[PDB]
């Protein structure tokens, strides 16, 4: 992955003119610094390996966190799967229009002790359950629901004190690639919903406790971390400049191009 | 010389005395769809002479305080002859595109336009909590124009049309990453874009998905000394390439 | 059970790991590939595309288009300075929010030569000559046309080709430089000077303009990815 180097030159004077170009044709010129001044023939050994698409993307990042309280009615958390709730990853993925990649998933779970009232509480080890529901499946509504059977729905059980769990999901989409932008409506009358929210139908995620409220309540907190593999991208995009506003849409407030200086000649 | 192009498709031809080179997409040419790629169970149709001719939209007048105009591309041709007929009668379809914008003036005027085409161009509403209606996104073969100021918040469903943010909240200086061309009145006279079909799905319905958007932004304001013609228009010419259809259903 | 010892460094979670994981979709059938035009495969393909830099930052043009226009008019005397700004593609605000400046904000280290394309968007009957000068650091910013010609420069004359390019070469004591502002790895300044005046005939406006572009050459390389300081988020988007 070695970058090319430059070659020496001699003093030249002819009407072969590389320096004068025409940018009106929409073509970036391919001049070399060996054509504007005399240079030395240098060996070069830099690479562009750390600038590939995979090294730019295959690094994990948090996308969401949620809580739930043990000693409560319907203490259980849910979250619709989307990647436009955190400003760091959403801004990174909006550099490309069409993405097709493999996905890897990890979790990390902490806990906390609630201000209870019982005397000399001491809890055993707690375990947690994460169940994925494909779009169209049944829904849970309480902590002891028959939806938690996990008959066919893939799920995982995890214990505190051990390593964080990890699973891997292959490329699941109706089309050929995930799309970061969709300019259209759902209805053929061109009404109602407009934007990326129409395609965003991938399922939901439910977390819940396994054990019971023994004597004192416990509030936990999970965090979900995405990490892509085998990435392929198409149609690069200029980066998002202004701040993000919403998740279902792409609305924005107007802002200047950059911060300003005091003069056009100042330094 | 290299200044002269001659573009002929079907029954209509466009020639020009001087213009720059033609910029062709992302390096490919528009093609028909091969058997290994298809998912339509039925055989498509190809009119291919009744659709691969040129069309002309409504011309707009370039003024001094002009902000910029746009069109949603496979929507403004929905009344343009048999292509407008064939768009109404099918369920699927994919098209290529050739775009040729032209605007002429004397050697005594000044100004430099920018013509870029963007695939998958979302917009933003005035009120942040809503999305704008259909009629503000495009007109039938007419231009929607930008403003050099900020659209207010009191409006319900209107597109925020601040020029320096381009409606998508990006920096307009970075817009040249898409295939673009320049029209400088000092040396150039017209621009030519050739674009292939860009989508995640090999075919699409055209009524509820605009996969291409054309934008024209004046960086340098049009300037002239007194005595020349003050009324200068801008015309566009759009012709599709190798289009086809599937799923014959009623008219809508 | 094989006799093995747990090495230090297990049961950890690294932000940039690389391992294999058991799948959750057993024998999933993936949708086949598709020949989508414009497949990028390295980040330096974006970094070669030029972009218009907002030079005219005079505190009111940033919410306009006039930040990109560089005002050029006919004078009476000679030797004026058109503009000037330091060359730091990750530190200066002028080259910050441009496309090359944005990719550079995702890293720390960089090297390579930088092109500077200039287009004269004036009349056809206008004519002028210019001195596009670059100076390496070590002294101050040059102050006259005589001082700038001792640097590395080119004398662009407008003609039928209404474009020109400057290529500032890579002159550094180190193999790479920081994108963060520092005394130790400064890069010098770029200035543009009126070589002659601007010749205009009668019945022409005397106020022309020039546009600017900025791109990298083929020797460009970055290193040591970091997290960008531009966007910031407090609560969740919904």
């Amino acid at each position, epitope marked *: 992955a070695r970058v090319a180097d430059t070659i020496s030159s001699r003093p030249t004077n002819s009407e072969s003119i590389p320096a004068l170009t025409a940018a009106e044709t929409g073509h970036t010129s391919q001049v070399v610094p060996s054509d504007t001044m005399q240079t030395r023939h240098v060996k070069n050994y830099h690479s562009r390996s750390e600038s590939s698409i995979e090294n730019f993307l295959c690094r994990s990042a948090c996308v969401y966190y949620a809580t739930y309280t043990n000693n409560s009615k319907k203490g259980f958390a849910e979250w619709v799967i989307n990647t436009r709730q955190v400003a760091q990853l959403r801004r990174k993925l909006e550099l490309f229009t069409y993405l097709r990649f493999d996905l890897e998933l990890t979790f990390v779970i902490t806990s906390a002790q609630q*201000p209870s009232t019982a005397s000399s509480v001491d809890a055993p080890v707690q375990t947690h359950q994460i169940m994925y529901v494909p779009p169209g499946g049944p829904v849970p509504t309480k902590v002891k629901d028959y939806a938690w059977q996990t008959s066919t729905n893939p799920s995982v059980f995890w214990t505190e004190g051990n390593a964080p769990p990890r699973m891997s999901i292959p490329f699941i989409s109706i089309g050929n690639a995930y799309s970061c932008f969709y300019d259209g409506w759902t209805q053929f009358s061109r009404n109602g919903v407009y934007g990326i929210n129409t395609l965003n139908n991938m399922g939901t995620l439910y977390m819940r406790h396994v054990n019971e409220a023994g004597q004192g309540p416990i*509030k936990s907190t999970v965090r979900i971390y995405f990490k892509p593999k085998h990435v392929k991208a198409w149609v690069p995009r200029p980066p998002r400049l202004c*701040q993000y506003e919403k998740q279902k849409n792409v609305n924005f407030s107007p802002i200047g191009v950059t911060t300003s200086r005091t003069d056009i000649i100042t330094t | 010389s290299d200044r002269v192009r001659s573009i002929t498709l079907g029954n209509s031809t466009i020639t020009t005395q001087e213009c720059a080179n033609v910029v062709v997409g992302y390096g490919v040419w528009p093609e028909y769809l091969k058997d290994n790629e298809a998912t339509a169970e039925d055989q498509p149709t190809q009119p291919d002479v009744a659709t691969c001719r040129f069309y002309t939209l409504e011309s707009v007048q370039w003024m001094k305080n002009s902000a910029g105009w746009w069109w949603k591309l496979p929507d403004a041709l929905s009344q343009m002859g048999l292509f407008g007929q064939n768009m109404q009668y099918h369920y699927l379809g994919r098209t290529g595109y050739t775009i040729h914008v032209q605007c002429n003036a004397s050697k005594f005027h000044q100004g430099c336009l920018l013509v870029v085409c963007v695939p998958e161009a979302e917009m933003g509403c005035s009120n*942040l*909590n809503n999305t704008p209606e259909f009629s503000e996104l495009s007109g039938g073969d007419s231009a929607r124009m930008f403003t050099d*100021t*900020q659209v207010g918040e009191s409006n319900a469903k209107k597109v925020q049309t601040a020029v320096w943010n381009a409606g998508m909240g990006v920096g307009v200086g970075n817009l040249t990453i898409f295939p673009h061309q320049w029209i400088n009145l000092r040396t150039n006279n017209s621009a030519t874009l050739v674009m292939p079909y860009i989508n995640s799905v090999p075919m699409d319905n055209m009524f509820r998905h605009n996969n291409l958007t054309l934008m024209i932004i004046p960086f340098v304001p049009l300037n002239y000394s007194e005595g020349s013609s003050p009324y200068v228009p801008i015309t566009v010419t759009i012709a599709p390439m190798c289009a086809e259809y599937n799923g014959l259903r009623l008219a809508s | 059970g094989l006799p093995v010892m747990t090495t230090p460094g297990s049961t950890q979670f690294l932000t940039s790991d690389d391992f294999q994981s058991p799948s959750a979709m057993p024998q999933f059938d993936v949708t086949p590939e598709m020949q989508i035009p414009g497949r990028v495969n390295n980040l330096m393909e974006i970094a070669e595309v030029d972009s218009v830099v907002p030079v005219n930052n005079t505190e009111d043009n940033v919410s306009s288009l006039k930040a990109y226009q560089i005002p050029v008019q006919s004078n009476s005397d000679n030797g004026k300075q058109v503009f000037g700004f330091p060359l730091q593609p990750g530190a200066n605000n002028v080259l910050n929010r441009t496309l090359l400046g944005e990719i550079l904000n995702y890293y720390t280290h960089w090297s390579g030569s930088i092109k500077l394309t200039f287009m004269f968007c004036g009349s056809a009957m206008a004519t002028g000559k210019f001195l596009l000068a670059y100076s390496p650091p070590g002294a101050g910013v040059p102050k006259n046309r005589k001082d700038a010609m001792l640097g590395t420069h080119v004398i662009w004359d407008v003609g039928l080709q209404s474009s020109c390019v400057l290529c500032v070469p890579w002159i550094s004591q180190t193999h790479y430089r920081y994108v963060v502002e520092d005394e130790y790895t400064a890069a010098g300044y770029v200035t543009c000077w009126y070589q002659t005046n601007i010749v205009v005939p009668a019945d022409v406006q005397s106020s022309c303009d020039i546009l600017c572009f900025v791109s990298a050459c083929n020797d460009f390389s970055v290193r040591m990815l970091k997290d960008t300081p531009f966007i910031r*988020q407090d*609560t969740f988007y919904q």
Partner: antibody, heavy 117, light 106 residues
Framework: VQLQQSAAELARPGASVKMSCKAS????????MHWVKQRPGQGLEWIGY????????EYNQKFKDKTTLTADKSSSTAYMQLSSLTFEDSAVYYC???????????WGQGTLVTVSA | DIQMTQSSLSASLGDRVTISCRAS??????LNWYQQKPDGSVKLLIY???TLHSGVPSRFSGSGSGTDYSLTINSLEQEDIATYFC?????????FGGGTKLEIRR
């Protein structure tokens, strides 16, 4: 990061006053800035906002004629200038920063503006 | 304009309290809950119907859907004795609720 208002003032009925909202700890030109008004026996009322990147103002329909929202990029502060002061204006004023979507995260300390004879 | 109706509540230490406010029409779950301290400081607790801000205790919780929405504190303490407001974020312009004071029982 915090928002710093000025002190309390007093003015003749019909006169004008100008307060300040000193912003520090964050980049000034990025985010917007608003102004609300709370009468002491009432709730809260929104007045208007001002984008310092473009100097664009927009009021509520109750205060379309009176207030003037000004801000300068240098000192990173904003001024809310009231005109034709009456006894309705005897209230407490806050300046606040609008969130990512619609919330108000950072709030100033509040100042008291009274009119009397 | 969206009308925001909401008045004065008293309760003792460590009990479960609730505050409820409704709108004029449906707001589709775009609600916030603020707290104005007795000295004159203002902070944000729940930036949605249920999701707490970072840095506040977990004693607070909010619920409700459609028109009717409720803010609940499970255990009352001294630092919580202030007023609280609800504010819509759906339509221009932003309308705030009325005051709702808290105080000791006896």
């Amino acid at each position: 990061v915090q928002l710093q208002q000025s002190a309390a003032e007093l003015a003749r009925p019909g006169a004008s006053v100008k307060m300040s909202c000193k912003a520090s700890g964050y980049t000034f030109t990025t985010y917007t800035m608003h102004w609300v008004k709370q009468r002491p026996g009432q709730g809260l009322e929104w007045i208007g906002y001002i984008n310092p990147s473009s100097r664009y103002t927009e009021y509520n329909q109750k205060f379309k004629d009176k207030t003037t929202l000004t801000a300068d990029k240098s000192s990173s502060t904003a001024y809310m200038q009231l005109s034709s002061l009456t006894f309705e204006d005897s209230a407490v004023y806050y300046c606040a920063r609008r969130s990512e979507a619609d919330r108000f995260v950072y709030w100033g300390q509040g100042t008291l503006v009274t009119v009397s004879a | 304009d969206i009308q925001m109706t909401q008045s004065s509540l008293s309760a003792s230490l460590g009990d479960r309290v609730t505050i409820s406010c409704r709108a004029s029409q449906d707001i589709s779950n775009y609600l916030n809950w603020y707290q104005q301290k007795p000295d004159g400081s203002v902070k944000l607790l729940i930036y949605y119907t249920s999701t707490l801000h970072s840095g506040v205790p977990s004693r607070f919780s909010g619920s409700g859907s459609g028109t009717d929405y409720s803010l609940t504190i499970n255990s009352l303490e001294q630092e919580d004795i202030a007023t609280y407001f609800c504010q819509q974020g759906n339509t221009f312009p932003f309308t705030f609720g009325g005051g709702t004071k808290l105080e000791i029982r006896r």
